[PDB]
Every structure is written in C-alpha cells, then in structure tokens.
Design a protein around this ligand. Sequence first.
Ligand SMILES: Nc1nc2c(ncn2[C@@H]2O[C@H](COP(=O)(O)OP(=O)(O)NP(=O)(O)O)[C@@H](O)[C@H]2O)c(=O)[nH]1
Ligand SMILES: Cc1nc([N+](=O)[O-])cn1Cc1ccc(F)cc1
Ligand SMILES: [Mg+2]
Ligand code: NA
Lengths: 167, 166, 469
Amino acid sequence: GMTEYKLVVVGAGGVGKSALTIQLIQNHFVDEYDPTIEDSYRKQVVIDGETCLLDILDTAGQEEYSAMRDQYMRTGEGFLCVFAINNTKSFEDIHQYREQIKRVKDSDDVPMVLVGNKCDLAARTVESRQAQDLARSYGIPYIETSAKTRQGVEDAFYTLVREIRQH
Amino acid sequence: MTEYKLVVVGAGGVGKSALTIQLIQNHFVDEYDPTIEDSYRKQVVIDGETCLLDILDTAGQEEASAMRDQYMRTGEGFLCVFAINNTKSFEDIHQYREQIKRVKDSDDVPMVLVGNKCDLAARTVESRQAQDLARSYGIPYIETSAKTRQGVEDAFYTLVREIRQH
Amino acid sequence: GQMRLPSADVYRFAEPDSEENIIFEEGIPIIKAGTVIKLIERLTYHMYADPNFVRTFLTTYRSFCKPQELLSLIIERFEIPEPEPTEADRIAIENGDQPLSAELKRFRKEYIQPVQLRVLNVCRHWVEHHFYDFERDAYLLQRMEEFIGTVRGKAMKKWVESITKIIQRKKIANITFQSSPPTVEWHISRPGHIETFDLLTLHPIEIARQLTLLESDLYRAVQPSELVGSVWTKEDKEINSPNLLKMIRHTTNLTLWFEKCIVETENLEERVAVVSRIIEILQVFQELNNFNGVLEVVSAMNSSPVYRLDHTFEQIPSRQKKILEEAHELSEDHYKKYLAKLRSINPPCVPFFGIYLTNILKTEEGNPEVLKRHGKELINFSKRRKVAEITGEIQQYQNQPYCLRVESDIKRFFENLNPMGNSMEKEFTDYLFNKSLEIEPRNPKPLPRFPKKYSYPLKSPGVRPSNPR
Ligand SMILES: Nc1nc2c(ncn2[C@@H]2O[C@H](COP(=O)(O)OP(=O)(O)NP(=O)(O)O)[C@@H](O)[C@H]2O)c(=O)[nH]1
Ligand SMILES: Cc1nc([N+](=O)[O-])cn1Cc1ccc(F)cc1
Ligand SMILES: [Mg+2]
Ligand code: NA
C-alpha cells in the first residue's frame, strides 16, 4: 500500500530536541502526550499530494548510551540532525553526527536535514547564516523550528521525506 | 497480565508488614514500626500465568479501627493474619472476617487464614484450633514465618489462586 | 447527613470542590488537575486512603511545590479545629449534666483522626522513601522533627513515637532465600588467578552471572530523585543522577569491551571463537532475564565495526545465529517484543533503562505544567501521575534479588574494565573501525591472513551448568 518512511532524530541531549517529534505527532491543537501508547511515533501524512506513513525514532534521553547510537541509526532511511540555536556545543556536535550516520549507513549520500531548534527565550548563539553555511557545505537543507509554537516542524519532516523521495 | 488486589489484615504486631516485605524484597524486618497504610506491587508467574499483585498492608493498631471499610471495598482477596504466640490476635480474626463480609456484602470472599511467627517455639494457638476455624470459613490455613520465609509464598499465592477461581 | 466542616475562613481545606480548584478524570476519584490546597486535601482525605496517590505526590511534587512549603501545608492540614457544642449539648450543660457531644465525637472519629493519621502517613512515607529532601536541607529535617515530636494526644501517640525513631535511624543510616545459589563455575582461569582473567578464560556462565549481579546492583541503586524533572539530561546531571550515569557508563563500557575483543582478534578462526563466546554469554543473560546484558551484546554486534564483519558472521554456527537474531528482534519496532517479554517473565530481571528515560523525558516535555480553567491556573496532576507510573514500574523491578553468589575477583575484573584507556571517545571508536577495516577490508580488497594470538584452547565449555556433589 502506502510507503512507510523510517526517520531518525539525532542530536545533543538536554536542549529540547524531543519537542520536534512531540509537536509533529501531537494532537496539534491539544498540548498533551503519552509516549508509552503504541504508535505515538507513527503518523499518516500527505506530502505533495502523496499519502505516506512516518515512523519516527527519537531516543531523546538516551544520549549517554553512546555505544547504542550505531544500532539506532541503522534503522533509519533519513535523518534529522538537530541542534539548539542557543547552544553552540550542540551545533559543533553536528559534524560528528553526520560522519557517524555516513559510516553506519555506509554511504556518502544519506538523506538528512539540518534542524536548528529554538527551545526557549535564552539568547541565540548560533546565527542562521552560520547554520545555512554549514548545511550548504554538506549539500543538505536547513530548517529552523520553534519548540513552543510548532513553527517549522512540518517543514523539517516534510523536507526530509522529499530528500528521501529525490535520492 | 491480570492484576490482583490483595489486602493483608490482622491485629497489631502479628507480622503483616514483615510478611509483605519478605515476599516483596526477600528481607526480614526486625523493627516494629506500626503501619498506617502501605502498598506494594509484585510481578510474578503463578501456575504458568504472569500477574501483577497489588498488596495493601493495613494498620492493626486499634486506634485505626474506624478506617477499614475504605480498603475492604477495594480488595479482591484478604490474608487474615494472626500470630501463633498471641491468643488475642487469633480471637481478633473473626472480627476482621465479619467486617469484610459486611463491607463486601458477600459470604464468598477469597481469604486465607495465616498463622504467622511459626519459627517461634512458644506457641499458644494450636494448629488444630486454627484449622477448625478455617474449615468453618471454607478457607485454607497456612502457617508462615516472615523471618525464615516458611510458607510465605504459599500464603500469598494460594490467595491469588482463590481470586483467580472466584 | 454529612458532617459539618470548619469554616473555610479558619481552615482552608474545607473550601467546597469546584471546577475552579479541582478537576477529576472521567472506585475512588482520579484527579486530573487542582490547586495545591486541593491536592493536599485529597492526599489526606477523610473518606479513603490512596497509597498510590501518596507515592505519586511525594515522588513528583517538587515540580509545583517546594519541600519547605509542603511541610507548612501538611502541618496546616493537621491542625483541624473542633466544633463548638451543639444546642443539645448546651441544654445538658445548663442543667449540670454531661453532654452527649454526639456531633463532636463523630467529627473526631470520622474527620480529625483519619485526616491526622493520613498526614502522619505522608510524613512517614516522606522520611522513609524520599529522605533526600532532608539530607539536602537540614532545616527541613529540624522542622519535621519538631512537628512530629510535639504532636500531643493519645490517638496518634503510637505513630508519633514510631516516626520519631524512624527519623533518627534514617539520620545515621540482609537477604534470605530458601534455595542455595548455584556453584561458581571456572574454566581456564582458576580461582585467585586474576591476572589470567579474560573473555575466553573465564567461564561464560560465570561471566554472565557476575555481570548480572553487577548490573542488577546498578539498576537497583537508581532512585526517582535522579529521574524526575529530567535531571539526568541537564547541566547538573553528574550531581543529580550519579547512580543512573554509573549504570549507563557500565553498559557502554561493556559494549565497547565486546567490540574491542572482537576487532582486536585479527585471526578469523579466533575471532569466530570470540563472537561465539559472546553469543553464549548472551544466551545466559537471556536465561537470567538480564535484558540490559542482552542489549549490551546486541548493541556490540550491531556496532559499525562489528556489523560489517561478513566473513566472521558466515562462520557462526546456525544455532548461535538464531540466538543473536531472536535477541535483536527484541528491539525491533520500538522494542515491541522486549516490552512484551519484560511484562511476561518471572523476576528477578534487569530491565533496559533507556526506554524508561525516553518515556519520562517525553512525558515531561510533552505535557503542560498547569491547566488554565476559569481564569485559574491548576497544577496538571495527570502529567505527574504519568511520570510516577514509570518510576513505579522501575521500582517494582528493583525489589527482587538474584540468587547468585558473588565472586569478588571476577566482580573486580568487570568493575575495573576500561577498554577506552586514556583515549577520548572519537579517537577510540575510530580505532575500532580502523581495526575492522584492517581485519576484513572493503571489497574488492583481498582478505588477509593473520597469526593466532591465543595460546590456550578456544573450545567453549558451553553454557549448561554443572553440579558435582
Ligand atoms: N520471630 C518472628 N518475628 C516476626 C515475624 N513476623 C514479624 N515479626 C516481628 O514482629 C514485630 C511486628 O511485625 P510487623 O510486621 O511490624 O507487624 P504488623 O502486623 O505489620 N504491625 P502493625 O499492624 O502495627 O502494622 C516485628 O518486631 C517483627 O520483626 C515472624 O514470622 N517471626
Ligand atoms: C549479521 C548480523 N545480524 C545481527 N543481528 O543482530 O542479528 C548482527 N549482525 C552483525 C554481525 C554479527 C556477528 C558477527 F560476527 C558479524 C556481524
Ligand atoms: Mg505493619
Ligand atoms: Na552556547
């Protein structure tokens, strides 16, 4: 039937990464969530007129299990590499996440998007030009998202699905 | 996984808490800290079926005697505990039996009669007297020691089997 | 009729329930949201006990109430005014007779004594199971000692004297089985010869047993204080979540040790023996319900350095391929089969902690702290109940001890394992991957041959236990 896309969210912990998938999968208009319920990470969507199923792996909270990253990453067809726009270290981590994805998938051309996430009102420390330059150096899209208003969230996931479709 | 609501009742100091903590943690509590109300959970396979026991450990001290209806309403089965070296705790059993029957409005409530502290030599309640009482209630009688673990699993898991068949 | 209550002007906990101060979920009620006053009223309600609510509240309240303020509120709850004499009592007293005081006696028996006892039960649970509040705030402990130590009147006396003693014991602060643990098993390394201990020289049964004892102890040491508020992800994680982090770092180190044992065995035949031995350890982990250990092995086998070793995988016996594949399938589809298996086994077990961490974090991030109703902000208690359901599951599996004997030397060997040495993580994991490329080069580069490195027999003793008399 319809295509299923296995997407994997990766990025530094402690800086609001989980809000991306929560806001997508959520009842958009009721701020509530039970992550334990079967298929709280599956969503049927229509992208460019074509219906598909998103299966999203977000292991937020398990960042210290660093030797499990390879196994988790190998499940994915496309990757959202997320940093927080007020945490420069999370931005500097992106290079190593991308290198690890390429190694795990054994490919120099893995569908991925760079996501800059605004997780609070603390001062931005990564300017959008810096992130655009990094994304261009990798040949991948850059999307900025808000962890509170849902802005950019659909764009981040839909852009990644388009990267998979056009691979 | 079926969930079972067990309630442990009996006079103060007979070993309700020690029995429960032995079942839950494999540890014998030497202290006598009177309970107000405590609850425990235990996943265990009984007769090949996995279940989840919710165990309510209740207050035996008489000062709490007006607060029992609320927990007797929720319980599905009751361990009725006395101590084999305390005749008064054995005479208190029938008051718990009658209150449970009144609250649940039923003559057919899953129960097990438990004679605890069977590690102690200086017994004052004979097994025969307790067994006669159990037969009059239609329920099994199991002697236990929270100190040595003798009979402890048998008492709790017999009660589960009675709830299962109720 | 119902008992009359103190005036809400002298006693705040007698205000009537309304949608402006408490909201229930759709046979005791389940609270969705409420003011802190209403939550404390229901925590100590005169009509029923709610031990699950006491655990939930004491586990999670610091997200909406400070410890000092909680103590003030439950002391306020405790201090209930008694009603004045009724008209019938007044007429009796005017005639020089003793009043019946029927309404006063009922209010004492059915309101004051149950509420006061349930306040003391909150104090008892607070001290016994959440004592860290008092370890971190000595003045809070003084206030609790003073409150308990000055409760008068004989109805509460047994519990007041008990709680005083429990506090004093907690300030200065044994397992029984009916069966004996099985005999410790030995292989090439003999007792006391710690210098020869290694993956292939210790008995694989005993490796799995001693790692299970270690990992069980690490699992059992994690308290809810390390979890609520997602504190293990925040900047002070080393301060607030040290037992959790120790447990995770053990798991990571063992996974990396398995990878290192594999890729530093350059001879193909020897490397097959190494991988086969690790799968036998995995089989004993499964038999012991040590799911942390199962996934430590699976994570190593699916790591980038090991996963690509097709020549090694080809020579693994088919029965061991099936053991590894069944273990891998536990994690598939968001751990569907793992979750079902955990809920079906007979403990003791060692759960994989990572799923709990993700679920706690997402519950906290995905639900609001307050609900706005009729211009009021109510504490969203349903969110706290969801977190405490997870911490309660964790605690349920922390109770059951393993009936296995510690071997102090094998325990020390695994406690001191340090596969990374002084290297940083990236340097070390690049080293492992470069070793993988060395021992099994990318096609079409030819497969080299390498000399043997082990001088002792590679044959496994197997994982069925032995029992001499
Ligand atoms: N020798 C022996 N002592 C026991 C046994 N069970 C309990 N005790 C002891 O008896 C005392 C009372 O035990 P406890 O479990 O607190 O009794 P309880 O029925 O829960 N009391 P309460 O109703 O006040 O909560 C403790 O000192 C405990 O160590 C047993 O099987 N053998
Ligand atoms: C093929 C495969 N299946 C799983 N698995 O988890 O089922 C893991 N692997 C990788 C692998 C395992 C052992 C080895 F020696 C070489 C490679
Ligand atoms: Mg007790
Ligand atoms: Na920064």
